[PDB]
Amino acid sequence: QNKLEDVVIDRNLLILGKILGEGEFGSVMEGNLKQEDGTSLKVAVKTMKLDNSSQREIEEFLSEAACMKDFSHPNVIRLLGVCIEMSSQGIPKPMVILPFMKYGDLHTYLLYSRLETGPKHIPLQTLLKFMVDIALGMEYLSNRNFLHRDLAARNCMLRDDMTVCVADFGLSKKIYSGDYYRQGRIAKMPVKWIAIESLADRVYTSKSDVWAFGVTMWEIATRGMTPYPGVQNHEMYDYLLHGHRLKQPEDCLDELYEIMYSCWRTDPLDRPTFSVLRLQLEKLLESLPD
Numbered sequence: 001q002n003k004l005e006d007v008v009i010d011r012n013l014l015i016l017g018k019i020l021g022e023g024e025f026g027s028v029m030e031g032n033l034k035q036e037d038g039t040s041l042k043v044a045v046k047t048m049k050l051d052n053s054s055q056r057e058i059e060e061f062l063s064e065a066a067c068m069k070d071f072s073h074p075n076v077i078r079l080l081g082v083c084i085e086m087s088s089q090g091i092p093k094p095m096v097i098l099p100f101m102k103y104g105d106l107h108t109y110l111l112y113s114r115l116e117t118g119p120k121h122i123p124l125q126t127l128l129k130f131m132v133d134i135a136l137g138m139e140y141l142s143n144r145n146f147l148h149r150d151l152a153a154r155n156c157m158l159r160d161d162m163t164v165c166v167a168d169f170g171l172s173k174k175i176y177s178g179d180y181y182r183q184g185r186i187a188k189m190p191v192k193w194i195a196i197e198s199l200a201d202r203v204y205t206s207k208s209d210v211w212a213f214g215v216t217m218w219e220i221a222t223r224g225m226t227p228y229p230g231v232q233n234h235e236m237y238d239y240l241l242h243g244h245r246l247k248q249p250e251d252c253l254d255e256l257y258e259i260m261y262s263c264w265r266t267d268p269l270d271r272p273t274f275s276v277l278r279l280q281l282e283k284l285l286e287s288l289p290d
């Protein structure tokens, strides 16, 4: 009840503004959080669409959030706290309160960059820095024995200084911890980012995150293409069983593509660690002009 009390933010300190995004598993809203100093802080608010999905009490949700509040790394989003809102049937509904990242998610940013009004055309070297940024965040998380489990460009956020941070921890957990959700919440995992072994069995390790990182690198290199053009979601497991993998994007350095495809080796033990990936990418980025 020290870190558990500390993580909770009083609901009255929060004013909800507009909905920024709404999906099957929750919504993101703008909000304002009244400070101790009398000032207001702009925040994002993530709601969860919980309808009998959990097999633990809300304390469990809070203790996981408390652990994540301790994350301290430029490439990992740091949550501010959690607010609880009671349903009419007396069920607590948690709200994760995050600092507001003005540029939004990396995926959408990449797409906007392909329009005249958007961000300017993103140079190869900046694309590569995005990938290093994500590698550093995942290295930090994997060093703390966290499994991300929803690693995609849409769940990476852009800070005011164009630093990417890893976000959307809704499915994240410590290796060896129990499930918070029942069988219903793997449905949030997008199929085209799921490692072959995790499609075969309810099995997910840090090497499954490495696979998803390689898919994320590919999304970045293609400036936001959906993985596996021409392949439907329900075909993916067979496609991968036959040894097919993401194709090399146009203008992608051969070196970079080698790094990506090391992430999709059939045996998880043949995939690199995030430390190795990160160093390979830093080296590659260093080897190029300014």
Ligand SMILES: CN1CCN(Cc2ccc(-c3ccc(CO[C@H]4CCC[C@@H]4NC(=O)c4cc(-c5cnn(C)c5)cnc4N)cc3)cc2)CC1
Pocket (backbone or CB within 6 Å): 020, 021, 028, 044, 045, 046, 060, 061, 064, 065, 068, 077, 079, 096, 098, 099, 100, 101, 102, 103, 104, 105, 154, 155, 156, 157, 167, 168, 169, 170, 171, 172, 173, 180, 181
């Ligand atoms: C199994 N355990 C059970 C218990 N769980 C507890 C728990 C569950 C979830 C989280 C958690 C942590 C971080 C996030 C943030 O994720 C972002 C990526 C995706 C959405 C979302 N977006 C924004 O947050 C955002 C959007 C915008 C913006 C700008 N422009 N536009 C259009 C939007 C501006 N700033 C932002 N910060 C969500 C949930 C933490 C703890 C653990 C697991």
Ligand SMILES: [Cl-]
Pocket (backbone or CB within 6 Å): 014, 015, 016
């Ligand atoms: Cl409100």
Ligand SMILES: [Cl-]
Pocket (backbone or CB within 6 Å): 076, 077, 078, 079, 099
């Ligand atoms: Cl942060």
Ligand SMILES: [Cl-]
Pocket (backbone or CB within 6 Å): 021, 028, 104, 105
């Ligand atoms: Cl978002």
Ligand SMILES: [Cl-]
Pocket (backbone or CB within 6 Å): 223, 224, 225, 226
């Ligand atoms: Cl596209």
Ligand SMILES: [Cl-]
Pocket (backbone or CB within 6 Å): 227, 228, 229, 245, 246, 247
């Ligand atoms: Cl492909």
Ligand SMILES: [Cl-]
Pocket (backbone or CB within 6 Å): 246, 247, 248
């Ligand atoms: Cl190819």
